[PDB]
Amino acid sequence: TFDAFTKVVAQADARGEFLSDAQLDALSRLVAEGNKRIDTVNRITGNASSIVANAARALFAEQPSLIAPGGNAYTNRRMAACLRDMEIILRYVTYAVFTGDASILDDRCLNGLRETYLALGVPGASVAEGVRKMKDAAVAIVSDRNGITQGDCSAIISELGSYFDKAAAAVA
Amino acid sequence: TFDAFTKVVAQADARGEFLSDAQLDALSRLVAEGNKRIDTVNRITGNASSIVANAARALFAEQPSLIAPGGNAYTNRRMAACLRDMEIILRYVTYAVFTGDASILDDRCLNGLRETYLALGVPGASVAEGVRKMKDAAVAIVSDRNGITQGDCSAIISELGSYFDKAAAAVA
Amino acid sequence: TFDAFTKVVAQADARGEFLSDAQLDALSRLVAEGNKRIDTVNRITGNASSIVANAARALFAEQPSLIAPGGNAYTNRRMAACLRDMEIILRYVTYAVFTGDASILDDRCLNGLRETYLALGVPGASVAEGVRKMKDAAVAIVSDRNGITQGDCSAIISELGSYFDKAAAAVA
Amino acid sequence: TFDAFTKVVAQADARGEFLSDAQLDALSRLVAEGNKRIDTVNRITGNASSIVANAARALFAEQPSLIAPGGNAYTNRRMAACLRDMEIILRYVTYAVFTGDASILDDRCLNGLRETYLALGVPGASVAEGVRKMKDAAVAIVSDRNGITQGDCSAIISELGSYFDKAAAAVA
Amino acid sequence: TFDAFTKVVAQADARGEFLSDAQLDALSRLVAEGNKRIDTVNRITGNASSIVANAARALFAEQPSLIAPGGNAYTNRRMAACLRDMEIILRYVTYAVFTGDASILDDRCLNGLRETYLALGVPGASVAEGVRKMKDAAVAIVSDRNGITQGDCSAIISELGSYFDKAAAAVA
Amino acid sequence: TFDAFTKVVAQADARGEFLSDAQLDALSRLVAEGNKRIDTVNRITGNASSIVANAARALFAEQPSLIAPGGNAYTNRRMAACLRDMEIILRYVTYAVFTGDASILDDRCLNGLRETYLALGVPGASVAEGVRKMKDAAVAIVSDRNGITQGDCSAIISELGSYFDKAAAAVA
Amino acid sequence: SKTPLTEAVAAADSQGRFLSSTELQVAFGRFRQAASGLAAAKALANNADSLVNGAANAVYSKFPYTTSTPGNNFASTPEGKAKCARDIGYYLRIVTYALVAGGTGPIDEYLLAGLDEINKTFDLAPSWYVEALKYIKANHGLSGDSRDEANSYIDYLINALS
Amino acid sequence: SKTPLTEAVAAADSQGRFLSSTELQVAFGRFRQAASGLAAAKALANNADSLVNGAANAVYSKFPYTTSTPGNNFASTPEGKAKCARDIGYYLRIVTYALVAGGTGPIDEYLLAGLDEINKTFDLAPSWYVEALKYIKANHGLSGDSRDEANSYIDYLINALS
Amino acid sequence: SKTPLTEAVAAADSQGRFLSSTELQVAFGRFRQAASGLAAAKALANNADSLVNGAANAVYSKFPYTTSTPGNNFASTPEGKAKCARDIGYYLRIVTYALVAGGTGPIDEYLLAGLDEINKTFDLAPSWYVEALKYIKANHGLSGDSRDEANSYIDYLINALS
Amino acid sequence: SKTPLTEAVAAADSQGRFLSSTELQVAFGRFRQAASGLAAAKALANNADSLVNGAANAVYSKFPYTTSTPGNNFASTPEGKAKCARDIGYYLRIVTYALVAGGTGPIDEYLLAGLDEINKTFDLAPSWYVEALKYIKANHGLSGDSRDEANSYIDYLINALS
Amino acid sequence: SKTPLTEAVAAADSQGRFLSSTELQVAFGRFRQAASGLAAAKALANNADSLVNGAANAVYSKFPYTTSTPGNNFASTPEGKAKCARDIGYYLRIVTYALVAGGTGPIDEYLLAGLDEINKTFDLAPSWYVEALKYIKANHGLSGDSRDEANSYIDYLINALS
Amino acid sequence: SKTPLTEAVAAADSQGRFLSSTELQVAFGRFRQAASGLAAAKALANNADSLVNGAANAVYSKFPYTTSTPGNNFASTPEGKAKCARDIGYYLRIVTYALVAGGTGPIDEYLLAGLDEINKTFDLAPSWYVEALKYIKANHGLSGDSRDEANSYIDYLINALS
Ligand SMILES: *C(C)[C@H]1/C(=C/c2[nH]c(/C=C3N=C(/C=C4\NC(=O)C(CC)=C4C)C(C)=C\3CCC(=O)O)c(CCC(=O)O)c2C)NC(=O)[C@@H]1C
């Protein structure tokens, strides 16, 4: 996988050149925004259990057929597995925010999930709705101003949002 | 794998229903025929080697090209593998009769066979004939009237024949 | 895998026949010149490092794109990897000359190599020329009349080449 | 491991001898009392969790140093472990009653356990008291006249007790 | 293993108590001298290879028996083994300074080492001498005033000293 | 392990000396007698099964208690284990003769054998008699002057017996 | 899943052996009890509606707060109570499968597996279900071997919820 | 060794599980069988003499070359027939052990393990033992359950020796 | 257990290498945080009585049935209250340890491992601890880096209980 | 299959190394043998009908019950005679192959692997073949290295047969 | 690709856990460094011509034989010097990447892995590169944290080359 | 100690097999060469003074700086020259062991294992030894088989040094 830093290094080494100032200044920006980045990771993690359960409750409420006898979430074993998947994706998204690159999420989580689901009969489109649920919840948690030093977090929130988007589209 | 019992159960919970009073009257019938089933398992088992041996002999006498130098069964290592294949099918077939469901026979033996023989170059059609000679032998061993309390056993014989036919058709 | 001897035995066994006099005269000729087969092997191995070093240097000199940044052999780790490949092909080729068979070369080295290289993005056609450069270097070293009892080693020289050629065609 | 049957067989084979009529009837007596043995296993198993739970509570209420900070069952993880050891000992004891022989308990559970505790720093003596607590509770359960066709289950009850004693003995 | 922090935490938990102010304000002083701890680790590490090579030399120059044929550091396989050992001890000693607790060096490195050298025949006293040379060489490296901001860093030098001493005493 | 040649070499390096002229000539004489050593290996090997079988019969004949029920040899499983031990020893013995050194025998066979027998309760003194009998049958087969070129292989015969004597002593 | 028949065959398979007199004795024990297992399954099924509603109420009385405190995981709303009743219906029905199979298999498949995560994630109290189970056991009306087998499955679950 | 009771516990132990209704069913299956299994062991034993000598002779008659040809593996000497009579006794004694244990375990333990390698190294024809077993099966005179299980073991050995 | 210092050496040791710039940074991060953590621990330690008893009352307040329902798992007796007061204090104390170590390490080691097993076995509702924890967080009175770190260990525990 | 050459290359390959003085000596040893091996292989081949028929009669002569006793496994019919003749011929041909390869490879692959399984199922006595092999050894009339080479394989099969 | 950021997630992932206070302190340490790290990267890159050309001369001056001795692996030809300069440039470039990443990762991945191999095959003396590295180190002009991190890498390579 | 005899047995042992014709051929190859290999060892040993001293001088000649440049790794002092002489002798002696053994065993064990690590740690140039080894090959005075076997070990070392 890559860092926001190793990502740039790679692109540069492919050309045998040092980093261009436009590349050095792009990273100095991510460094200065650092605290906001660290706050985003902690806020989602501190609420992970609620982000998952609530996002799951909504899903089943709008798609009852999932929990009707006949599954695919109907057994207790698969209901557990489904909850697990939601936790897994959310965990991998925080990894992306923490490193500042999607490689971690794409390379170890999303890659091959659309097909792994297809081969099992799990409704990938449903998983996409669950991921979107968590995105909104997570975004709102990150946007909350109560109990933090005020500032403009818009960049970090849009980046965060795109990772969730990648998770959705990867199984849509 | 499924038992005749758990097979019905799987059908019921997918539907989220108790077994129908009807479904229970069927299983009870298999239960009341329990002795006959135990006997057919015991009978074939006590004659495994000769079942294998005789079917093997007859098959080769009818298809000598399998025994000649360069035939599939020609060497000792492959003759052994050939006899082995024969007792495998027989053994799994007994497993099927004992549990009253073919799932053990399908998941653990047959499934994949046809393709395995293809890549290796084993005459599947010839295996099929061998298995059929085993069936004929087994059925007569099972229906012999001597030394056993008498009654109608026709139902377990055909249920036993179906397991042999499944194996037979899985190879060609 | 087979050696010149078991190869013939194989062709004879599938026919269920004793080796013909033509098969025996052929093998007994190979035995008679075994001394040349011994030297050829010792001469290649005796110059193993330089044959690979010099061929690799000429290979990069001819295709500098391979070592410039962004090239397949560009990094250090991959440079070591590419050299290893050069060493492994040579080792198996000597294996083939030693057994008097190519099966060790084909089964245990070349089979599936083209597929691996394509999957990794390793310029297979570039590997083929590196192999051809080793061939010429090895051929010349083996044909060298100095320090060895004089004679014509051309039958073995021709066999050595066929193995190098199989390697080149297999990676392309 | 042995059965109540196979334990007798081992004794007779060693001596090269058929089982005497005496040893044979001694076993038919055990067989005629199978139901009781079966009920004993079912009863303990039906109350397994409460057997363990209450004994742990009683043990701690009697030896508070156990759970005060710095004691062997303090912290969560030790405690869980301690609770598991109790369930394990009780599980294996039920295996002894079922097989009608102690070897399954001594072999797979008790042998080496004493040394296990010492290396760890676990107080065997108190682990021993815990076992005695489960015994009294299990014996009281097995000996309850409520809800069972009446009879004398005292041979099996002293039999149960012998295994609990073996467990307490192996621990200290 | 523990770090300076968890060590104190373990002693406090054993007594079901919060840290005192003596424990707290003591950990505060360590935190305050953290930059020095970090510089010492970096300095030893930055001269790892030369510290080992130079001490090894001095060792062999004063104790040539080790290097005479049939000596212990004699072959090339052992001599490499001996150098590695020197690097290992130094490596683990840097881990002790980094964590602020010796448990890492004792638990994973020094534990049972004397036993190990006894069964093999490795002159443990010479190993101890090699370590002492690494001590003196390392201390001088960390006490060097050039190239860093000046201050009294004799506290962590004493701590480093105790780790090196533990190492030497564990082999002697 | 060691070769007769690597045995002398190992000793030489420890002293850091070239082999003395006596050592080299001593090895030259072994090489010159190599044909006899080869025949010794082949004979015994062509006669292993009978050498083992006839040795066991003789042993049990003289010691019926080994076979009587309760005897160490009494079961089939263990009679099979006993036959195996005899083959193993004879086999490692031929290894000793083929390499001109006893290391293979003491290292992967005799080493700790006496002890595994005391733990299992296998009568070492009986095994020793067994090996003892395999020594004479072997000696007489190797000594047979028929179907071979005439010469005196007394040196090789004495060495062979020595390996046998060692195995018998490494137990009894 | 686990039953006398699958366990017997699986054990023979892992050993690469043909069935023998031991597995035959296993088969006799299963039929000697299938009759009363099925009968127990038929009776429970036929009395299901009163057993579930009766078990449901018993829990609402033992735990009044589950019906008078707003919470997604409580039954203080019409939908909540339906979820609880549905649940109690799952336990009962799954117990009838264990009786049909003659083993814990269907239970360990459809319910047990992941049962701990589910209760924790949804804040459902295991004691609620232990209570629903006891009411079911005290309202069986079952007798003989039919009672014992049914109870061994209920106590098995009660054990799993503690 | 393998018996209905040892297996049930071996399975539960490797699974780390308490016994449940399945193992109990297995216990009932065993105790249903034990009766006829013990009476069979008692009957075969009371008639050991007649059966061994009887079987031994059926082998010598179907294979006369074993009593007339010289060799360590044959019975052309008083000592030869002794080993043979002794062996048959072993086969029969071990069979009454399987009946006692209600499983092949004792056959597996004291006989079957290492049998082929014993017959090969000592050049004993497996067909000779097959013949002796056929005689025992045809002459023990047992009926019902005792016959069925006893023959289960005789045929197990026959299958093993072929 | 688990802290920035122990993980760094662990990763390095597993990879068989010397520490480098990456682990030094870890150490710089650890020391930037340490002062805050220790003062958080010092603060929580001094406010122990108030916090523990204030949290206990918050729990009994949210769930009145825990003080009025007969049972060994409840705080309906003075014996149960002392057990409940003790447990909460365990959490608070264990949390101050996390602050001293700068990681969940002491929480993992002394509390979290085995927690679920313990809560189920003794029938202790996890939500009960999820409230006391909310009380501690809403009343600790910590700000800045001390607030942020303390809350992560508290939210870490709340998440582990749901 | 096993031969000096394939074994050499296989060992070097396992250790991922180039051939050395050792493997070259193996080749010299091979080439020292191989002419003797091909000549013996050629000589036995040219004397096949005499060796096979002779060996067969040595068998029928030593075991007369094999030509007088009815059975799928006996040579009492002309077809049974055909099989025995063919089998003896199989051993003879596969032996010539080992002489060509200079190793037991072709014996291992074509005839030894599974040999015991075949003798058991089809009730063929290893002694019949041991006798056939002995006759062949006493009658091939081989000399020198050709004889010693050939006899190593005949004795290898004999040992494998007992 | 070893850095604080990738190691924190790798360890977190291998343990199947969400990030926590520990990895946060990791990030703080990373950001407390990145600025000086990136600055040192820009500075070194800005004076690459002097550093590199100034380094090659140090080597030739110290090891004059490299410029007078003929051979493929020496700098006594125009192309020999060209490659020696590129080689030094590679070292510097990759060190800047190490500074941009705040870890040895780019060094490990692009240079170190396979270095000894390359130096031995192409007969390049490790002490040549040590001299170059020492020249770069002494002609930094870098101060503080930029000087310290940049020197840990320069010394990291020197250690690897000795 | 990789040698024809030990390797053969190691292989047969790893397969649980007795030695056969293939291993026998290996022995023949071994003894058909040990005669010249042994005589070669004697000769190299008796010419040790001129070979070692001549090689050391050939090294100092092709690498003038090794006797001028001060440094622990160089021979600019008598101490350095003595060590170098010493070093050269080790190679020669270990090569005679290879001849006595008929394989690379002695080389691999006492010299080659850990070689690269040693030349690196003490900054010794592999080219130096490569050249000393060329001088040895030039000056053996060996011919035929003795020459060819010696040269294979000298080239085996040359390879390992490149
Ligand atoms: C000893 C602990 C106490 C006791 C035991 C006792 N039990 C029985 C008889 C039976 N027990 C069963 C048990 C089961 N049947 C089942 O289907 C299941 C579930 C799989 C179980 C656990 C059965 C079938 C019987 C026999 C039929 C019957 O109801 O009698 C007896 C009687 C005798 C006999 O040997 O059969 C006794 C004495 N009785 C006590 O008073 C002790 C406290």
mmCIF file of C-alpha atoms and ligand atoms in Angstrom, chain D residues 31-43 139-146 148-154 156-157, chain G residues 32-33 36 144-153, chain H residues 20-25 28, ligand 1:
data_model
loop_
_atom_site.group_PDB
_atom_site.id
_atom_site.type_symbol
_atom_site.label_atom_id
_atom_site.label_comp_id
_atom_site.label_asym_id
_atom_site.label_seq_id
_atom_site.Cartn_x
_atom_site.Cartn_y
_atom_site.Cartn_z
ATOM 1 C CA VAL D 31 -25.580 -52.481 30.719
ATOM 2 C CA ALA D 32 -28.799 -53.169 32.591
ATOM 3 C CA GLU D 33 -28.192 -49.930 34.491
ATOM 4 C CA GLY D 34 -27.443 -47.796 31.419
ATOM 5 C CA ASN D 35 -30.433 -45.589 31.622
ATOM 6 C CA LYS D 36 -29.285 -44.307 35.033
ATOM 7 C CA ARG D 37 -25.790 -43.636 33.685
ATOM 8 C CA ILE D 38 -27.358 -41.808 30.749
ATOM 9 C CA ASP D 39 -29.575 -39.713 33.057
ATOM 10 C CA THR D 40 -26.549 -38.787 35.143
ATOM 11 C CA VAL D 41 -24.738 -37.341 32.118
ATOM 12 C CA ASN D 42 -27.827 -35.497 30.885
ATOM 13 C CA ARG D 43 -28.485 -34.033 34.331
ATOM 14 C CA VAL D 139 -24.259 -34.971 43.219
ATOM 15 C CA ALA D 140 -27.249 -33.141 44.722
ATOM 16 C CA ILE D 141 -28.642 -32.616 41.196
ATOM 17 C CA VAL D 142 -28.142 -36.216 40.067
ATOM 18 C CA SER D 143 -29.711 -37.487 43.290
ATOM 19 C CA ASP D 144 -32.966 -35.448 43.049
ATOM 20 C CA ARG D 145 -36.112 -37.604 42.982
ATOM 21 C CA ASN D 146 -38.164 -34.945 41.165
ATOM 22 C CA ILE D 148 -37.615 -39.066 37.167
ATOM 23 C CA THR D 149 -38.929 -42.632 37.273
ATOM 24 C CA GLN D 150 -37.783 -43.661 40.751
ATOM 25 C CA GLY D 151 -34.954 -46.100 41.450
ATOM 26 C CA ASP D 152 -31.615 -46.614 43.158
ATOM 27 C CA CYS D 153 -28.942 -44.616 41.387
ATOM 28 C CA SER D 154 -26.405 -44.994 44.167
ATOM 29 C CA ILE D 156 -23.567 -44.543 39.632
ATOM 30 C CA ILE D 157 -23.613 -41.702 42.167
ATOM 31 C CA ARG G 32 -35.328 -45.790 18.957
ATOM 32 C CA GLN G 33 -35.918 -42.144 19.699
ATOM 33 C CA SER G 36 -40.794 -39.543 20.327
ATOM 34 C CA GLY G 144 -41.504 -39.221 28.815
ATOM 35 C CA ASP G 145 -38.573 -39.424 26.379
ATOM 36 C CA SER G 146 -40.355 -36.679 24.435
ATOM 37 C CA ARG G 147 -39.978 -34.372 27.462
ATOM 38 C CA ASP G 148 -36.322 -35.125 28.197
ATOM 39 C CA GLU G 149 -35.084 -34.666 24.638
ATOM 40 C CA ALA G 150 -37.028 -31.397 24.293
ATOM 41 C CA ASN G 151 -35.706 -30.146 27.632
ATOM 42 C CA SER G 152 -32.105 -31.088 26.834
ATOM 43 C CA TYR G 153 -32.358 -28.721 23.863
ATOM 44 C CA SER H 20 -25.752 -33.792 24.105
ATOM 45 C CA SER H 21 -28.846 -35.714 22.967
ATOM 46 C CA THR H 22 -26.826 -37.214 20.129
ATOM 47 C CA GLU H 23 -24.286 -38.919 22.252
ATOM 48 C CA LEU H 24 -27.065 -40.132 24.551
ATOM 49 C CA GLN H 25 -28.865 -41.722 21.599
ATOM 50 C CA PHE H 28 -28.956 -46.163 24.080
HETATM 51 C C1 LIG M 1 -30.247 -41.494 39.104
HETATM 52 C C2 LIG M 1 -29.435 -40.355 38.798
HETATM 53 C C3 LIG M 1 -31.798 -41.200 39.351
HETATM 54 C C4 LIG M 1 -32.728 -42.153 38.626
HETATM 55 C C5 LIG M 1 -32.525 -42.662 37.383
HETATM 56 C C6 LIG M 1 -33.322 -43.597 36.564
HETATM 57 N N1 LIG M 1 -33.591 -43.302 35.225
HETATM 58 C C7 LIG M 1 -34.327 -44.359 34.713
HETATM 59 C C8 LIG M 1 -34.841 -44.571 33.391
HETATM 60 C C9 LIG M 1 -34.769 -43.873 32.249
HETATM 61 N N2 LIG M 1 -34.138 -42.712 31.998
HETATM 62 C C10 LIG M 1 -34.273 -42.352 30.694
HETATM 63 C C11 LIG M 1 -33.634 -41.111 30.183
HETATM 64 C C12 LIG M 1 -33.802 -40.456 28.987
HETATM 65 N N3 LIG M 1 -34.642 -40.873 28.046
HETATM 66 C C13 LIG M 1 -34.510 -40.004 27.076
HETATM 67 O O1 LIG M 1 -35.196 -40.086 25.921
HETATM 68 C C14 LIG M 1 -33.592 -38.942 27.282
HETATM 69 C C15 LIG M 1 -33.243 -37.812 26.355
HETATM 70 C C16 LIG M 1 -32.374 -38.296 25.156
HETATM 71 C C17 LIG M 1 -33.127 -39.271 28.579
HETATM 72 C C18 LIG M 1 -32.135 -38.552 29.377
HETATM 73 C C19 LIG M 1 -35.083 -43.414 30.063
HETATM 74 C C20 LIG M 1 -35.533 -43.552 28.631
HETATM 75 C C21 LIG M 1 -35.415 -44.386 31.047
HETATM 76 C C22 LIG M 1 -36.212 -45.659 30.931
HETATM 77 C C23 LIG M 1 -37.645 -45.531 30.672
HETATM 78 C C24 LIG M 1 -38.315 -45.009 31.910
HETATM 79 O O2 LIG M 1 -38.929 -43.915 31.877
HETATM 80 O O3 LIG M 1 -38.205 -45.725 32.918
HETATM 81 C C25 LIG M 1 -34.551 -45.375 35.716
HETATM 82 C C26 LIG M 1 -35.280 -46.679 35.511
HETATM 83 C C27 LIG M 1 -34.681 -47.775 34.872
HETATM 84 C C28 LIG M 1 -34.147 -48.338 33.995
HETATM 85 O O4 LIG M 1 -32.977 -48.804 34.141
HETATM 86 O O5 LIG M 1 -34.575 -48.157 33.031
HETATM 87 C C29 LIG M 1 -33.889 -44.842 36.919
HETATM 88 C C30 LIG M 1 -33.819 -45.530 38.260
HETATM 89 N N4 LIG M 1 -33.832 -42.437 39.326
HETATM 90 C C31 LIG M 1 -33.725 -41.880 40.474
HETATM 91 O O6 LIG M 1 -34.642 -41.881 41.412
HETATM 92 C C32 LIG M 1 -32.392 -41.141 40.728
HETATM 93 C C33 LIG M 1 -32.579 -39.771 41.396
#
